[PDB]
Design a protein around this ligand. Sequence first.
Ligand code: NDP
Ligand code: NDP
Ligand code: FOB
Ligand code: FOB
Ligand code: CL
Ligand code: MN
Ligand code: MN
Ligand code: MN
Ligand code: MN
Lengths: 410, 416
Amino acid sequence: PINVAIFGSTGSIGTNALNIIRECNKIENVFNVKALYVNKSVNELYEQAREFLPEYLCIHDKSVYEELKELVKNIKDYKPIILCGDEGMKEICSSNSIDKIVIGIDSFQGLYSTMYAIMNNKIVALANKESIVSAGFFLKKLLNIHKNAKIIPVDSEHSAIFQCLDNNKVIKTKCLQDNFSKINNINKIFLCSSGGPFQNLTMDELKNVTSENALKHPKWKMGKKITIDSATMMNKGLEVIETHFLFDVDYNDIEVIVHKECIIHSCVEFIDKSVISQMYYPDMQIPILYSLTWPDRIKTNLKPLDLAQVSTLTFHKPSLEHFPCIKLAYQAGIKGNFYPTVLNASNEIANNLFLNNKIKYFDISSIISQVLESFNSQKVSENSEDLMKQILQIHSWAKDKATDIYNKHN
Amino acid sequence: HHGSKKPINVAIFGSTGSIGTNALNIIRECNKIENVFNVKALYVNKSVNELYEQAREFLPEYLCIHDKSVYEELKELVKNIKDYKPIILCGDEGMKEICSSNSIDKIVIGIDSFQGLYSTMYAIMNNKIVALANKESIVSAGFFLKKLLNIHKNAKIIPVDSEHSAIFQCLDNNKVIKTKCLQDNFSKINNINKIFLCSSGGPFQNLTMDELKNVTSENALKHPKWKMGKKITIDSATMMNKGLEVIETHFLFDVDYNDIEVIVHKECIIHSCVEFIDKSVISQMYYPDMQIPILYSLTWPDRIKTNLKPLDLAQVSTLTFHKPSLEHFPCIKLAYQAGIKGNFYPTVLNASNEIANNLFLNNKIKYFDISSIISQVLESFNSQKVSENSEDLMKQILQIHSWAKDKATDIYNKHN
Ligand SMILES: NC(=O)C1=CN([C@@H]2O[C@H](COP(=O)(O)OP(=O)(O)OC[C@H]3O[C@@H](n4cnc5c(N)ncnc54)[C@H](OP(=O)(O)O)[C@@H]3O)[C@@H](O)[C@H]2O)C=CC1
Ligand SMILES: NC(=O)C1=CN([C@@H]2O[C@H](COP(=O)(O)OP(=O)(O)OC[C@H]3O[C@@H](n4cnc5c(N)ncnc54)[C@H](OP(=O)(O)O)[C@@H]3O)[C@@H](O)[C@H]2O)C=CC1
Ligand SMILES: CC(=O)N(O)CC[C@H](c1ccncc1)P(=O)(O)O
Ligand SMILES: CC(=O)N(O)CC[C@H](c1ccncc1)P(=O)(O)O
Ligand SMILES: [Cl-]
Ligand SMILES: [Mn+2]
Ligand SMILES: [Mn+2]
Ligand SMILES: [Mn+2]
Ligand SMILES: [Mn+2]
């Protein structure tokens, strides 16, 4: 059986992880949900605890610790280990009764648990792309020390690229490892995108778009943060960098492609020019499941893809003029160093400002552009400990700088 | 990263045809990047002059002409070529001697129709890697080849047919190594749940039933993109090619018929898709060009660099998929019925189609007469006990094949 832990179990990813796990278990008892971890959603967590009965429960907000223990106490025949915050998170990561950990925690915050899951040589099903954009080089170093740890991508596009690769070569290397794309004969990557809701707007129409126009979609809900990045397409920009680090693919070899039907989740072009792609309805259950079964696949009762029904699939190149955040991602990525870290931190700020109606669409990229321009490359620390505090320091600085540029009312 | 060349010894059967030309085309091109392919033998039927030109360029250790009438003429032309002493052979004999060479590893089978089955069975008998393009040898001898491959455990059949190359390319080779094509449980070991078999649809895809009745071989032989043999080109028009590929899929990957869906994709970019048990679908795509599937069958389990134009999805812009009308392409229905019936129906199916296809090509019968004649031959045939040992099974297959073609001819005569 596969002993899994779900970090950010109450979120979009966490819930979909639990859904797909619940269904597969009806066919055969393969997954054992050993630990659930969230920030402050104590009631929802309590509901999940009741169903799955994980040996471990962890709430990051220590101020709702008693409430949690008080609710859980109402579940008959159940004596789980209830922990709190960082220490609680680290306690779960070091347990020997846990093999894989799904990181469904959003934002920079997700980096901490990703880091500890790796330090404990676990298999990390990573959905939190911010961890790889702000600490890509750091995660690669960390993975070179804890050689049994692995980062299996959950982000649908990267899961797609991962699935397209021949596992006979994948097994001979590992995500984030040097020469990954060379060992897999990777020539180029077609990074597919839904295009977001503003994809067909003219410049004048984009100028006045709002966060209310961009948030709601109809296949499944996602966090507000990622929903907004999807709108500005900064999501795909962050995903370009994530692709670079995860598969050691050069930036001039990643092509963003807008595929509005979202059936083809991404394609991989090999050195002979043949192209392999992964496809299915826009659902996160597949990428999450594959991250937990790889290198194997298991039966599910998901609705089969009906191509005749879908009938049409379209492709076009995004306009960098309308979606300038994509260009900024490439530039920060190509500059390397801590620019990707600055890009992400300043976007967290610009993103939230837009969400809360504080700035307009183009102010988002402008703010981010200015922070990237202000930052000066720093010598990359030699050991992980210092490199970590450096990433944190630069992250905080980029955010204060973004806020500052904004505070001058731009 | 460098030119650490470890050459691949290859033989090209049917080197002067569509597959053979495309084969040498890609070998020639990849060798300009890093000399990795060494053609040890070429083998044609009657095209002695074109074979001559190929020998001059590739200088293969072996040369073979199947028709004895041009054997001497071949030995003549080759004389000119200086500093070249190849072993010129002829007929079946020359083909068996080539398959038995120890200097050859991979044999590309580009021989058309039923004839391709002979060299196919002999390549397997010599434990060679068979980059099989000839689908007929698989439809009419599927379970024979299966038994043959269980005896010659080192022999392997790598598919060159585009759709089937696509499916194969979508698999994890760490699972494929535990088995091999045309072996029971291939789909289970690879967790294959279902196959989407793509088709160009052919030239009659938008014609009405009344229009179809009067279409001709001339209208079917004008495929706007590249050159292929006349049989397959007609088979593509009636979509019997796809029906044959349905059975080919069943035998190559052990996929149930009710798990094979024929889909019409006119852009011909997505060459086929593989649905795994989790419902995830992986597909192989590129411009419709036989060079990739051919090249892949010779590089597997690896891939090598090429200078082929890169697929440009943006330019392509649109991809369409739709169910094929069984009313307009009844040949598809017949293929499924024969495959599902098992035993020797596929053999009867392929044989009667060969007759029906040729009759149409020479404007002797009409579009719906093809589907009708095959239907009659199939209903006329009755199961037969499957022979245990391969030699007798091979006879039985040759017997049923000849019986089927003869039957189809009778029906044509009683009608004319
Ligand atoms: N949703 C999607 O389809 C996709 C998401 N992703 C990525 O996956 C990540 C998560 O996304 P998503 O599920 O949408 O986000 P959500 O906002 O829906 O959920 C975030 C989850 O993380 C938890 N969390 C927040 N802070 C902490 C903390 N300090 N300690 C423990 N848990 C915490 C939340 O708990 P609480 O409920 O208590 O607040 C919540 O369960 C993001 O990095 C995103 O970019 C990538 C591809 C697709
Ligand atoms: N062409 C294509 O794009 C595709 C073809 N295929 C399959 O590949 C096979 C070949 O097709 P294609 O190339 O179109 O056919 P062609 O008619 O173009 O070529 C047939 C080749 O086989 C040779 N040949 C015929 N009989 C013999 C024999 N007895 N001994 C040695 N060689 C012989 C011919 O030699 P000669 O020139 O001397 O007559 C010729 O080189 C078919 O089974 C087809 O279904 C599958 C997918 C795509
Ligand atoms: C589903 C997923 O992996 N995402 O990263 C959400 C991103 C957006 C998305 C939305 C719907 N389907 C696919 C992707 P986009 O950034 O617009 O491509
Ligand atoms: C390219 C190939 O492998 N074929 O078998 C030719 C098949 C025909 C074809 C023609 C043109 N392009 C692709 C396929 P169709 O049967 O119409 O799909
Ligand atoms: Cl598998
Ligand atoms: Mn994504
Ligand atoms: Mn794969
Ligand atoms: Mn400066
Ligand atoms: Mn084909």
